[PDB]
Amino acid sequence: PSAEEFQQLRKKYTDAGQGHVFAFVDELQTGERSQLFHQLSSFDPVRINELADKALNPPASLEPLPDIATASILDSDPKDLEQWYEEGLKLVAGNKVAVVLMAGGQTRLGSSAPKGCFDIGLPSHKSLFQIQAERIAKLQLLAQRISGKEAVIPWYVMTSGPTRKPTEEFFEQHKYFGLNKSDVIIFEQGVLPCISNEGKILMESKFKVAVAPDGNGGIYQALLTSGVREDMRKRGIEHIHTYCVDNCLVKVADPVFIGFAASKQVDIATKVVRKRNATESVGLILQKNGKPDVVEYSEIDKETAEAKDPKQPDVLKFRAANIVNHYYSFKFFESIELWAHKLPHHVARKKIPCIKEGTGEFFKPEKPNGIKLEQFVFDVFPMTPLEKFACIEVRREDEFSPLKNARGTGEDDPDTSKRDIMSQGQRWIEKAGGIVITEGVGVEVSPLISYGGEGLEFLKGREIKAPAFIEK
Numbered sequence: 001p002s003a004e005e006f007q008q009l010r011k012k013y014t015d016a017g018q019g020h021v022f023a024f025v026d027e028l029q030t031g032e033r034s035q036l037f038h039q040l041s042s043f044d045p046v047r048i049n050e051l052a053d054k055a056l057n058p059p060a061s062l063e064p065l066p067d068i069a070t071a072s073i074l075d076s077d078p079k080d081l082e083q084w085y086e087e088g089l090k091l092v093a094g095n096k097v098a099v100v101l102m103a104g105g106q107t108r109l110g111s112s113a114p115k116g117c118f119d120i121g122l123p124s125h126k127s128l129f130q131i132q133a134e135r136i137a138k139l140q141l142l143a144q145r146i147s148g149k150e151a152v153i154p155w156y157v158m159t160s161g162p163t164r165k166p167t168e169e170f171f172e173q174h175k176y177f178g179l180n181k182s183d184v185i186i187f188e189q190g191v192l193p194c195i196s197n198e199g200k201i202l203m204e205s206k207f208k209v210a211v212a213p214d215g216n217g218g219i220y221q222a223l224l225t226s227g228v229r230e231d232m233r234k235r236g237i238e239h240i241h242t243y244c245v246d247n248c249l250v251k252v253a254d255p256v257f258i259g260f261a262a263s264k265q266v267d268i269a270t271k272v273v274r275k276r277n278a279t280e281s282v283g284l285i286l287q288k289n290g291k292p293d294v295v296e297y298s299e300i301d302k303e304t305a306e307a308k309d310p311k312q313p314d315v316l317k318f319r320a321a322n323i324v325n326h327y328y329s330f331k332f333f334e335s336i337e338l339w340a341h342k343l344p345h346h347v348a349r350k351k352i353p354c355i356k357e358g359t360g361e362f363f364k365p366e367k368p369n370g371i372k373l374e375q376f377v378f379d380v381f382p383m384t385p386l387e388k389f390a391c392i393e394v395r396r397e398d399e400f401s402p403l404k405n406a407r408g409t410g411e412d413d414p415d416t417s418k419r420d421i422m423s424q425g426q427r428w429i430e431k432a433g434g435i436v437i438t439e440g441v442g443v444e445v446s447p448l449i450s451y452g453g454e455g456l457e458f459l460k461g462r463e464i465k466a467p468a469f470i471e472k
């Protein structure tokens, strides 16, 4: 507001080679001026230059994880599965388990609304959010069955600038899907400015810098400034499940996963499924320089993606596909301030509509004109010793069905999503003794009826005409 303050900021940016952001301040109303001022005050231009330099002029041994760090639901001792399930449910019952939902993604889907609101066309027309909340509701009920006391899994929902407000409205319109409003917290990750190919801050309007969400790796710094970590501490949380909004099969706060990690006493555990083929758009979990790590599908070499296991020439050497289902101890979140700044910035070339520095005409670029920076949630893995890390294989058909693409794509889209949920529901019923007569597919089982296939005895011997919906 004061010329003294506005000039000092203009000197900082102009000294930093970013003076062009003041190019149009004389055309500006006093409100558009204070907006430009406060947004520019929130960035350190010299820090921006450092980020841009490392992204635009940037300056190792890879093996599978050692078996001491891996497990698999597909061949664990059934006694371990039962023990891990029970211990997981006891942790839920003790009110020590929190969930962080990563829902700050806008693009491959072409929907205006947050991805969590999407109706994949199930007979219930439930959104991804609602299905996920109902797994929470159901899990809290199952855990009460082994304590006779209320169980609470707080739901921390991480949004972005783009998705925050519509997410909150959506939850409020659905009355938080029957959870207690005081146990669901919506918070927001931060942003970084978008950077041109020449290292210049890009301007979205004559008074606003173009910025973008700082990647799901922004979760950690967001846990601090939002107050979520403090809330977790107040609730006595000790175990956190973090996952991506787009997976309609996500086993929220999965008791087997939690029990497995807590009994191994790891700082961090993560779920994988067998990679479907060499080109699947998934990060690969592996051992890099003797540490647990993830190579993202956008950064891996073709030679690495196609390497083959020696005695199995038709199988991929690296096939532990990351399904974005992570466990943390609370102790680990208590260290965020020591290492949140060590997280790398990954770089994507983007077409960012902006104002031309010269004339000032808002234009959509032909070719990629700049970059976006993103920290990745899993880049904490190499901070974690192998002995404090666990990677457990799950079943894709039960645990991983991501919504990445629009209806009509043919993979990882609303139709494969719906088909996976309903194939799962039929499978559950059949194992419980039900019969599904199909004349044309599958059955949608509400999470409030069954979290993971239990509680379906009441359908033994009963015939079900697919498509069907089983609800309370």
Ligand SMILES: CC(=O)N[C@H]1[C@@H](OP(=O)(O)O)O[C@H](CO)[C@@H](O)[C@@H]1O
Pocket: 216, 244, 281, 282, 283, 284, 296, 297, 321, 322, 323, 324, 375, 376, 377, 378, 402, 404
């Ligand atoms: C930073 C991050 O979480 N990347 C994840 C995430 O990729 P996306 O770019 O967001 O589609 O989801 C994939 C699973 O669907 C996972 O394999 C990958 O490693």
Ligand SMILES: N[C@@H](CC(=O)O)c1cccs1
Pocket: 298, 346, 347, 348, 372, 373, 374
């Ligand atoms: N997760 C992706 C998102 C995108 O490509 O838009 C990124 C990789 C590297 C920087 S951003």
Ligand SMILES: N#Cc1cccc(N)c1
Pocket: 267, 331, 332, 335, 338, 339, 383, 384
């Ligand atoms: N738990 C824990 C912890 C504390 C400090 C640093 C790292 N890498 C982990």
Ligand SMILES: [Mg+2]
Pocket: 067, 068, 069, 070, 071, 072
């Ligand atoms: Mg193993």
